[PDB]
Design a protein around this nucleic acid. Structure first.
Length: 155
RNA sequence: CUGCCGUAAGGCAG
């Protein structure tokens, strides 16, 4: 379990943008930072997830090794959003915790973020937090920080 | 939104 570090990024409430819109922007920006860092050892989870309202919640948690996390934060990927966010301190995770897969699931009672890309076009990216396991099977993460096998601590 | 694997079901990538 070499991914024992995390950081919480919290959305500040905003009069003109609902949470879901900011989160999508946060999440698109992280996507860009992941595509640049390279690798597959950075995951995310949405700790305030609400199953019932199908809402991702107001927090984005980023999971990484102590130094994967540092390389990531020393990038200017949050340039332009920071005013809309509050950040926790990079910390060691609590233990013990369950682990789960947070994956892209391509009627969907699922939360989603809206992104763009070469077309101008908007698309929804659907996200599912998986069943709690006692331990973590090995595996990596996509360029969205979503599971391609890997698991993240849930707390 | 585009695209990949697959004979379509199922699945995947940015």
């Amino acid at each position: 379990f070499t991914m024992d570090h995390y950081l919480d990024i919290r959305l500040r409430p905003d009069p003109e943008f609902p949470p879901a819109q900011l989160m999508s922007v946060l999440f698109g920006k992280l996507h860009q930072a992941l595509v640049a860092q390279g690798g597959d050892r950075i995951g995310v989870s949405f700790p305030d997830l609400d199953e019932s309202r199908s809402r991702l919640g107001e927090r984005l948690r980023i999971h990484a090794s102590a130094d994967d996390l540092r390389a990531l934060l020393a990038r200017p990927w949050l340039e332009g959003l920071r005013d809309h966010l509050q950040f926790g301190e990079p910390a060691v995770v609590p233990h013990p915790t369950p682990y789960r897969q947070v994956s892209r699931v391509q009627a969907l009672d699922l939360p989603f973020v809206t992104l763009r890309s070469s077309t101008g076009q908007h698309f929804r990216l659907f996200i599912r937090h998986g069943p709690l396991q006692v331990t973590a099977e090995e595996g990596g993460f996509t360029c969205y920080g979503l599971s391609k096998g890997g698991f993240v601590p849930w707390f």
